[PDB]
Enzyme design. Structure first.
Site, PDB file in Angstrom:
ATOM      1  N   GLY A 143       0.715  -1.038   0.048  1.00 10.01           N
ATOM      2  CA  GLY A 143      -0.214   0.052   0.075  1.00 10.01           C
ATOM      3  C   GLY A 143       0.862   1.357  -0.032  1.00 10.01           C
ATOM      4  N   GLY A 146       0.370   2.188   3.754  1.00  9.51           N
ATOM      5  CA  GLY A 146       0.949   1.084   4.391  1.00  9.51           C
ATOM      6  C   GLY A 146       2.264   1.408   4.452  1.00  9.51           C
ATOM      7  CD  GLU A 254      10.480 -11.468  28.823  1.00  5.52           C
ATOM      8  OE1 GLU A 254       9.719 -10.651  29.481  1.00  5.52           O
ATOM      9  OE2 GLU A 254      10.941 -12.586  29.398  1.00  5.52           O
TER      10      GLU A 254
HETATM   11  N1  LIG Z   1      -4.025  -9.755   4.411  1.00  3.99           N
HETATM   12  C1  LIG Z   1      -4.382  -8.759   4.164  1.00  3.99           C
HETATM   13  N2  LIG Z   1      -4.139  -7.939   3.271  1.00  3.99           N
HETATM   14  C2  LIG Z   1      -4.608  -6.959   2.793  1.00  3.99           C
HETATM   15  C3  LIG Z   1      -5.637  -6.421   3.255  1.00  3.99           C
HETATM   16  N3  LIG Z   1      -6.053  -5.400   2.670  1.00  3.99           N
HETATM   17  C4  LIG Z   1      -5.000  -5.117   1.783  1.00  3.99           C
HETATM   18  N4  LIG Z   1      -4.216  -5.839   1.868  1.00  3.99           N
HETATM   19  C5  LIG Z   1      -3.011  -5.930   0.955  1.00  3.99           C
HETATM   20  O1  LIG Z   1      -2.248  -4.641   0.937  1.00  3.99           O
HETATM   21  C6  LIG Z   1      -1.728  -4.278  -0.383  1.00  3.99           C
HETATM   22  C7  LIG Z   1      -2.207  -3.134  -0.737  1.00  3.99           C
HETATM   23  O2  LIG Z   1      -1.820  -2.080   0.181  1.00  3.99           O
HETATM   24  P1  LIG Z   1      -3.449  -1.359   0.889  1.00  3.99           P
HETATM   25  O3  LIG Z   1      -3.341  -1.719   2.335  1.00  3.99           O
HETATM   26  O4  LIG Z   1      -4.793  -1.668   0.254  1.00  3.99           O
HETATM   27  O5  LIG Z   1      -2.836   0.226   0.442  1.00  3.99           O
HETATM   28  P2  LIG Z   1      -2.960   1.322   1.612  1.00  3.99           P
HETATM   29  O6  LIG Z   1      -2.021   1.371   2.758  1.00  3.99           O
HETATM   30  O7  LIG Z   1      -4.347   1.520   2.034  1.00  3.99           O
HETATM   31  O8  LIG Z   1      -2.433   2.857   0.925  1.00  3.99           O
HETATM   32  P3  LIG Z   1      -2.973   3.347  -0.542  1.00  3.99           P
HETATM   33  O9  LIG Z   1      -2.405   3.129  -1.648  1.00  3.99           O
HETATM   34  O10 LIG Z   1      -3.292   5.059  -0.162  1.00  3.99           O
HETATM   35  O11 LIG Z   1      -4.614   2.616  -0.624  1.00  3.99           O
HETATM   36  C8  LIG Z   1      -2.196  -5.538  -1.208  1.00  3.99           C
HETATM   37  O12 LIG Z   1      -1.045  -6.435  -1.376  1.00  3.99           O
HETATM   38  C9  LIG Z   1      -3.355  -6.377  -0.577  1.00  3.99           C
HETATM   39  O13 LIG Z   1      -2.998  -7.602  -0.862  1.00  3.99           O
HETATM   40  C10 LIG Z   1      -6.419  -7.102   4.093  1.00  3.99           C
HETATM   41  O14 LIG Z   1      -7.457  -6.643   4.766  1.00  3.99           O
HETATM   42  N5  LIG Z   1      -5.703  -8.299   4.585  1.00  3.99           N
END
Ligand SMILES: Nc1nc2c(ncn2[C@@H]2O[C@H](COP(=O)(O)OP(=O)(O)OP(=O)(O)O)[C@@H](O)[C@H]2O)c(=O)[nH]1
Ligand SMILES: Nc1ncnc2c1ncn2[C@@H]1O[C@H](COP(=O)(O)OP(=O)(O)CP(=O)(O)O)[C@@H](O)[C@H]1O
Ligand SMILES: Nc1nc2c(ncn2[C@@H]2O[C@H](COP(=O)(O)OP(=O)(O)O)[C@@H](O)[C@H]2O)c(=O)[nH]1
Ligand SMILES: CNS(=O)(=O)c1ccccc1Cl
Ligand SMILES: [Ca+2]
Ligand SMILES: [Ca+2]
Ligand SMILES: [Ca+2]
Ligand SMILES: [Mg+2]
Ligand SMILES: [Mg+2]
Ligand SMILES: [Mg+2]
Lengths: 438, 54, 425, 344
Positions: A143, A146, A254
């Site tokens: 993301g 993220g 820890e």
């Molecule tokens: N395991 C898991 N992976 C997730 C989930 N939501 C998104 N992903 C993974 O996260 C990645 C994409 O990042 P996102 O979290 O969707 O993007 P973001 O952090 O919202 O950032 P933006 O680009 O601004 O939308 C992809 O590889 C998805 O497979 C979830 O609920 N569970």
């Protein structure tokens, strides 16, 4: 007692946060309205669950969490979901347009304009903690939020909270459940700027979570819900020591002491068992030796890799359910004779064990079946470096042609930061090989 | 095969078993990095407006 | 709340945009008067993307109709759904553009653009968070080509950080109004190379071949060709108009589809395409074999003559998403020699449960293939066959243009072809 | 239409398998860097195992067992035998070996001299061979001074000799292991013989003691006299054992060879098996054996990237496609292999 503030960043972080706090409340007997009948100290007390929850004069138990997303769609479900009553609005922070899967956008462009707001909200939770231990940061590699905003938040937390530990729960990019193409860039970008700012990080590869859902739960095409519910079982098992009475992993410090002798190598592999389909007739309950024996099978690892061809630096065994120390040693003996467990010569060849009698709680109607005993193994293996090689390779295929690089430079990032971050990973892969291979 | 530091409470117990013995950027520099990038976005947008002016 | 401002310019622009607002209006349940009468909440979930909500639960498309002569827009306002559009959003002149890029970009258009932008600004100011713009036009005519690209130049000046998305009909001698179409298309293409993030290339020749050969239609009309464009525009916008685990917005789709700034011209595709043996069920496999078949693509380019940089596919209808994954992974692993190996997983797939009108399931193809250079080769070849004799240049030099500007557009396109060639190897 | 890549242009074995794959019309070759492959014929050194088995919708297969180097390296094989209880240091079919590191760098220097002085005191034959460029000598001073990683193992002073000729020789058996870990032995072996009479007085001339196909074809003066290319196959060598010794190749030599292979491969199966991995493996092996005058077989070394005898390239390669490749990627006998059943 000492508090732990959880931070969820981006979609994956926010949703996984839901799967955990949903599970935490079922485990601690907290209802959606935030009420806890079993808590006898009203609006106060320093119990074990108080490390993740605070209490109001009205008896409400409120998570110590902060949800941050540069887009409001995913957090808005939380404002109206089943557990809407748990949080208050200050805890949920949402922007107006996301980061378009662009690390540069989440770190520099958008991140600069909302970072002081997050810190202020986080500071508001710190002022309630009588002895803050640190933060648990949930987020994704791929993301734009993220990856891009997380690495900035970490740089600032290390400033505003120097001596506080910071743990990560990161989502490794898997093609099967992602439509993005630049996730290698984002992952390797955020790992570079975040490495010196994180004391211990658990990586989950969606590819691993995916096949566990297709193979063990018979979900032909899993949804994010199926993936998160499972991921929270693992996260619940890892954080349980902080939320229940015990003596192993009693505070965030820890985790580094028991799992990371060398700083840059703070990515422990996680393994879980058993995972049984709730739709199943009725499974033969596994013994303590059969579930323990499973922790050394690649099938149920959070990151597909071959520990046989690495070297262990540490090892923890967290049990939940009907388990006693007598059975744990018996199982371990039988495995050292069959398996190939090569430890590094400058670390004791041993295992720390933690048993929690309460068995794993399951979300009603969820995919997982109730078991009497379960275990989660944390093991620091040079074999996890395989994940880095995979990701670094993909990075190299795109960067050789400079594909997609303009999207990042166009948000203010310098092209040099790429090769700078990539050279860092190259050193990270080298440190791993220096510790495992002969 | 030794079992050291056995801690038992009401909700479980924890112990350790040994099989074999062994053998940052300041708040000033982060604002410079941020502003340094905001400055490179300003310059790029200028060359676009200059281009459109021509 | 992520809003899109739609703009249709010129004859071709408005007639295609006209049907487009007719196709999606039916998919979202909006009648000719703007009243909702659907049956599923999914229809209104993302309705504000293309529709403004007025008083009385009325939904008014967020579209601006532009042309330099009233002929075509009097037809839209009297068309099936013509009453749905906002009266003010009709901006038009009287002189016409005479199929002349210079008139649309420098003289006639220059006199009306400020008033068109006054409307664009009024639609944006009401958007909670405007994603970006989308234009429908032709490049071979005078208004949508010359004035259209003029609007894009000015929209980017006022909204430099918004996504500019266009549906551009490329001229073909087989479906030609006038002989200057290569002149107008070569001039517009450079504007798009500079001031657009995504340009779906729609070649009238591919639309013609599809109606004759695959669709079995003796002599087509512009109306027949526009049904295809409607069906396509409906498809590539399912990501934006309906819900799903995708969560696609304009900038995210650009970041994943465009690895290089100037190579943002896509080849769209649609499937099925059946002649009236139309009631037969279509298995997911069949849907996929056609979706990649060149005969189902509107670029009039043979994809087997280049390499795919990125591919996006949207599947509409209640089908086995497990079977969707299997068949997609099959086409890649059966022809991986046509995909570049230096972009991992450069083929993505989104699902949707709401199928188009009168179809159990469908598939819309979005290809960023280097084969598109064949298109710019044809246009350049036709351009030079005339420019080397200055034929018909007086229509343009009489409007203020010099031959030097034509030479620049020549070398600009030839450059764009060389860029596509170094990436095919 | 399966797809495969090639990352070892120097491999004569799989160069024919690739030719056979394409001759079937159902296998397509890709560039040596395209990850969308069903089958990889990987490089010798530093093959990237970590990157295999992560392409959704593709079952990937590789022609190398990760970790097999523990068996095909000189020092690795010795350490494996002296440490693995399956084999034990008292193993009866492997020459008493020792791992010796040059003094410019654990090390079994003293352990070697102990058994060395013990032998030199007992009048027994105390001739050793050093290898990792080979030196054979009966003095511990020359062996150690020469090394200044290497291995010293007891040189077989009483090797079986052929007649006429009075010459040494070794044995090469090819063993294939499929993804399921079934152990298939190639019914056809070869004996790389020496064209020079065996002389035990002087180990200086290493042309009658070493049976390498390259040394005999370069430093020997009788190359090709008794048999074509110093290679006698199981049919002729079996008739010889019946005319001179009154026994067969199956009872006298083949039983021991089939036993040593099992013990080696069974020993490491827990460490290299791909029974539950995200990808599948298979590898061709080339075991080298010695035969003393008592018809007892010893294990010399195991080759992880062996070549094949000219006359047996077609039969074996086709067999690799049948039981190793097509067994995982089927197509649209009298197996030429002898399955060695075992407990997994
Ligand atoms: N395991 C898991 N992976 C997730 C989930 N939501 C998104 N992903 C993974 O996260 C990645 C994409 O990042 P996102 O979290 O969707 O993007 P973001 O952090 O919202 O950032 P933006 O680009 O601004 O939308 C992809 O590889 C998805 O497979 C979830 O609920 N569970
Ligand atoms: N201990 C020992 N006793 C008798 N002969 C020996 C021996 N060690 C090696 N040899 C001789 O050396 C040859 C094998 O050498 P070695 O295998 O160590 O080198 P190498 O691996 O480069 C040959 P290859 O790999 O082709 O089989 C055999 O022909 C054998 O006759
Ligand atoms: N697909 C399609 N193409 C059209 C239509 N009308 C015109 N064109 C094409 O567009 C080009 C002329 O542009 P036009 O729209 O007539 O010019 P303008 O109205 O002055 O902007 C010619 O190549 C026509 O073939 C239509 O309804 N559908
Ligand atoms: C090619 N014949 S045609 O299809 O009748 C046609 C010609 C010129 C312009 C538009 C059309 Cl549709
Ligand atoms: Ca309390
Ligand atoms: Ca720190
Ligand atoms: Ca005028
Ligand atoms: Mg997001
Ligand atoms: Mg016209
Ligand atoms: Mg060798």
């Amino acid at each position: 007692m000492r508090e732990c503030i959880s931070i969820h960043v981006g979609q994956a972080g926010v949703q996984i946060g839901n799967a955990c706090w949903e599970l935490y409340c079922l485990e601690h007997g907290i209802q959606p309205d935030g009420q806890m009948p079993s808590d006898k100290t009203i609006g106060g007390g320093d119990d074990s669950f108080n490390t993740f929850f605070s209490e109001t004069g009205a008896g409400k138990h409120v998570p110590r969490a902060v949800f941050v997303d540069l887009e409001p769609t995913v957090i808005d479900e939380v404002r109206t979901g089943t557990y809407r009553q748990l949080f208050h609005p200050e805890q949920l922070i949402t922007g107006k347009e996301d980061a378009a899967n662009n690390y540069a956008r989440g770190h520099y462009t958008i991140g600069k304009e909302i970072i002081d707001l997050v810190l202020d909200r986080i500071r508001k939770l710190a002022d309630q903690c009588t002895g803050l231990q640190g933060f648990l940061v949930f987020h994704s590699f791929g993301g734009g939020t993220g990856s891009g905003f997380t690495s900035l938040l970490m740089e600032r937390l290390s400033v505003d909270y120097g001596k506080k530990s910071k743990l990560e729960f990161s989502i490794y990019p898997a093609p099967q459940v992602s439509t993005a193409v630049v996730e290698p860039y984002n992952s390797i970008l955020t790992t570079h700027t975040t490495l010196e700012h994180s004391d211990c990080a658990f990586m989950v590869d969606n590819e691993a979570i995916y096949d566990i859902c297709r193979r063990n739960l018979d979900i032909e095409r899993p949804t994010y819900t199926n993936l998160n519910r499972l991921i929270s079982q693992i996260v619940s098992s890892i954080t349980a020591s902080l939320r229940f009475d015990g003596a192993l992993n009693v505070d965030l410090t820890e985790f580094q002491t028991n799992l990371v002798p060398y700083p840059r190598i703070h990515f422990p592999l996680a393994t879980y068992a058993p995972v049984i389909s709730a739709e199943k007739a009725y499974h033969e309950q596994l013994s303590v030796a059969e579930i323990t024996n499973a922790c050394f099978e690649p099938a149920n690892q959070m990151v597909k890799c071959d520990p046989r061809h690495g070297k262990y630096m540490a090892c923890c065994l967290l049990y939940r359910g009907d388990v006693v120390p007598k059975d744990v040693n018996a199982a371990i003996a039988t495995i050292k004779t069959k398996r190939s467990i090569q430890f590094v010569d400058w670390c004791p060849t041993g295992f720390k064990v933690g048993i929690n009698y309460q068995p794993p709680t399951v979300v009603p109607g969820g995919d997982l079946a109730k078991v009497q005993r379960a275990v989660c193994m944390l093991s620091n293996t040079t074999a996890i470096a395989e994940a880095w090689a995979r990701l670094d390779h993909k990075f190299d295929l795109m960067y050789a042609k400079r594909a997609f690089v303009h999207w990042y430079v166009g948000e203010g990032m310098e092209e040099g930061e790429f090769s700078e971050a990539r050279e860092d990973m190259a050193a990270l892969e080298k440190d791993y090989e220096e510790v495992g291979v002969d | 095969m030794e079992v050291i530091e056995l801690n038992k409470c009401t909700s479980g117990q924890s112990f350790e078993v040994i099989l074999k013995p062994p053998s940052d950027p300041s708040l000033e520099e982060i604002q410079k990095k941020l502003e340094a990038a905001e400055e490179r976005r300003k310059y790029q947008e200028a060359e676009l407006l200059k281009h459109l002016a021509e | 709340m992520r809003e899109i401002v739609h703009i249709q310019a010129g004859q071709c622009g408005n007639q295609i945009g006209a049907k487009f607002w007719e196709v999606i209006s039916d998919e979202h349940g909006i009648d000719p008067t703007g009243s909702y009468h659907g049956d599923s909440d999914l229809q209104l979930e993302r309705i504000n993307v293309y529709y403004n909500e007025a008083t009385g639960n009325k939904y008014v498309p967020r579209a601006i109709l532009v042309d330099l002569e009233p002929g075509t827009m009097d037809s839209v306002r009297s068309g099936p759904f013509g009453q749905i559009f906002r009266p003010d959003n009709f901006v038009f002149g009287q002189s016409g553009a005479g199929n002349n890029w210079a008139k649309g970009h420098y003289t006639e258009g220059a006199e009306l653009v400020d008033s068109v932008l006054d409307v664009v600004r009024k639609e944006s100011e009401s958007c909670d968070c405007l994603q970006g713009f989308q234009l429908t036009h032709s490049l071979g005519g005078g208004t949508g080509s010359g004035m259209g690209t003029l609007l894009i130049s000015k929209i980017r000046e006022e909204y430099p950080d918004r996504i500019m998305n266009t549906f551009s009909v490329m001229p073909s001698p087989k479906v030609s109004d006038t002989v200057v179409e290569p002149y107008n298309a070569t001039l517009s293409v450079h504007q798009l190379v500079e001031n657009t993030d995504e340009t779906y290339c729609i070649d009238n020749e591919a639309l013609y071949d599809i109606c004759f050969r695959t669709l079995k239609l003796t002599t087509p009309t512009y109306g027949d060709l526009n049904h295809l464009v409607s069906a396509t525009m409906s498809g590539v916008t399912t990501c934006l108009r309906f819900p799903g685990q995708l969560n696609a917005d304009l900038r995210k789709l650009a970041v994943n589809m465009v690895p290089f700034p100037r190579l943002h011209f896509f080849m769209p595709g649609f499937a099925p395409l059946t002649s009236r043996q139309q009631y037969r069920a279509l298995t997911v496999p069949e849907l996929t074999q056609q979706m990649f078949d060149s005969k189902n693509m509107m670029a009039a380019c043979d994809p087997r003559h280049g390499r795919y940089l990125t591919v996006a596919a949207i599947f509409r209808g209640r089908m086995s998403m497990k079977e969707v994954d299997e068949q997609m992974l099959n086409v890649q692993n059966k022809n991986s020699s046509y995909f570049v190996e230096w972009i991992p997983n450069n083929v993505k797939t989104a699902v949707c449960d709401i199928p188009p009108r009168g179809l159990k399931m469908s598939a819309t193809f979005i290809g960023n293939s280097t084969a598109i250079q064949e298109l710019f080769k044809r246009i350049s070849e036709q351009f030079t066959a005339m420019f080397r004799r200055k034929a018909f240049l007086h229509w343009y030099t009489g409007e203020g243009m010099d031959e030097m500007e034509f030479t620049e557009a020549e070398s600009n396109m030839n450059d764009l072809v060389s860029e596509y060639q170094q990436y095919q190897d | 239409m399966y797809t495969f890549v090639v990352r070892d242009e120097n491999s004569s074995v799989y160069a024919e398998v690739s030719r056979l794959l394409l001759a079937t019309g159902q296998w397509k070759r890709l560039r040596k860097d395209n990850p969308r492959f069903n089958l990889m014929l990987g490089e010798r050194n530093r093959l990237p195992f970590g990157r295999l088995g992560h392409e959704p919708g593709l079952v990937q297969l590789v022609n190398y067992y990760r970790g097999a180097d523990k068996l095909c390296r000189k020092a690795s094989l010795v350490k494996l035998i002296k440490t693995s209880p399956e084999l034990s240091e008292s193993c009866t079919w492997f020459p008493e070996s020792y791992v010796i590191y040059p003094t410019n760098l654990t090390d079994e220097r003293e352990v070697f001299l102990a058994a060395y002085n013990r032998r030199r005191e007992g009048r027994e034959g105390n001739v050793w061979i050093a290898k990792s460029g080979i030196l054979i000598s009966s003095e511990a001073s020359e062996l150690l001074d020469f090394i200044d990683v290497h291995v010293i193992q007891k040189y077989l002073e009483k090797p079986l000799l052929l007649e006429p000729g009075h010459r040494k020789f070794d044995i090469r058996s090819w063993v294939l292991v499929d993804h399921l870990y079934n152990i298939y032995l190639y019914r056809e072996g070869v004996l790389r013989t020496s064209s020079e009479p065996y002389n035990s007085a002087n180990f200086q001339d290493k042309t009658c003691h070493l049976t390498n196909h390259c040394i005999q074809k370069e430093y020997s003066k009788n190359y090709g006299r008794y048999e074509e290319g110093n290679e006698m196959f199981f049919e002729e060598f079996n008739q010889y054992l019946m005319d001179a010794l009154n026994t067969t190749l199956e009872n006298s030599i083949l039983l021991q060879i089939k036993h040593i292979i099992r013990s080696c491969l069974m020993c490491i199966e827990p460490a290299i098996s791909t029974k539950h991995l995200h990808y599948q493996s298979f590898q061709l092996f080339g075991f080298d054996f010695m035969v003393d005058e008592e018809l007892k077989v010893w294990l010399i070394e195991v080759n992880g990237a062996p070549a094949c005898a000219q006359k047996l390239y077609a039969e074996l390669c086709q067999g690799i496609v049948d039981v190793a490749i097509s067994s995982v990627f089927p197509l649209a006998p009298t197996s030429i292999f002898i399955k060695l059943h075992h407990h997994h």
